[PDB]
Amino acid sequence: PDLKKMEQESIDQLCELKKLKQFDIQPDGHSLFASILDQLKLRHDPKKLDQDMDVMKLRWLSCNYVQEHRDDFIPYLFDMKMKDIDEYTKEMEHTAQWGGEIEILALSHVFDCPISILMSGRPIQVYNECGKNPELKLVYYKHSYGEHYNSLHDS
């Protein structure tokens, strides 16, 4: 029922009201990490950031934060049966599989920042509503095709 254009049109007007601007993050399996990387290089202090930070290293940081804070990520893997917390980290770190809510909350605590996800038909979600570092602003598309993320610049 052309839900792709319907979601894009609502997101377009949503950022117009929020004074935000969309990016063109390539919609492959690294969209979430690339959008977070772009938001880090845009809103974070460059003197306090790893300049050589790339996608697969953010893939390594999220997977290690889950491995050392496993109890904080167990509830995000049940409901059927439960996905093995360890096997989930080895497949997310070495492949190009789509990242989700687990990688957002993990990286939000890794960099001590809020990470906002803008969606159409939903209020803004803010992960780590409390990080002292500047908030990263992302946008999620459900119908633009599975989990595609993009970066949000100012104005």
Side-chain angles (χ1 to χ4, degrees), residues 1-79 82-155:
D2 198 329
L3 323 170
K4 175 272 323 201
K5 181 220 221 163
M6 194 196 280
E7 179 191 43
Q8 188 68 235
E9 268 167 6
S10 148
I11 290 174
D12 286 0
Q13 287 171 6
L14 253 179
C15 314
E16 286 191 34
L17 306 158
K18 295 202 61 76
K19 311 300 176 251
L20 296 185
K21 199 164 158 188
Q22 300 193 51
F23 213 59
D24 44 341
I25 297 289
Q26 43 283 320
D28 55 54
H30 304 290
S31 46
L32 177 81
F33 305 97
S35 322
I36 285 178
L37 178 58
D38 181 69
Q39 285 291 306
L40 280 171
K41 303 173 301 203
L42 181 102
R43 308 186 184 273
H44 268 44
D45 197 3
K47 304 163 131 213
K48 307 160 47 169
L49 217 66
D50 188 9
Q51 197 299 308
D52 282 70
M53 182 71 63
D54 54 343
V55 167
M56 302 290 283
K57 176 166 188 147
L58 286 165
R59 277 191 182 262
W60 184 82
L61 277 152
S62 148
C63 276
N64 201 82
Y65 192 93
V66 175
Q67 271 301 327
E68 301 277 309
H69 307 78
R70 323 160 72 261
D71 300 353
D72 313 339
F73 298 91
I74 296 264
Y76 299 87
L77 309 141
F78 195 31
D79 263 356
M82 209 200 117
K83 173 59 177 280
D84 195 14
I85 180 85
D86 298 289
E87 201 165 350
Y88 173 78
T89 41
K90 324 301 156 158
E91 60 146 47
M92 181 65 73
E93 181 178 327
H94 307 102
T95 74
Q97 184 191 327
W98 321 71
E101 49 176 350
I102 291 176
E103 287 71 38
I104 298 169
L105 182 83
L107 286 173
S108 71
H109 283 91
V110 159
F111 295 89
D112 193 31
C113 53
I115 300 189
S116 63
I117 312 298
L118 188 139
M119 258 164 307
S120 100
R122 282 164 84 138
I124 309 193
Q125 326 197 265
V126 182
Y127 291 72
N128 194 19
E129 54 275 346
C130 276
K132 314 141 172 223
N133 289 336
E135 168 202 309
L136 314 182
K137 309 192 181 189
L138 314 174
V139 48
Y140 171 76
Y141 311 89
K142 172 160 184 171
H143 303 130
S144 293
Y145 207 166
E147 295 236 291
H148 171 218
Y149 289 87
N150 212 333
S151 183
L152 285 185
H153 292 231
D154 278 355
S155 97

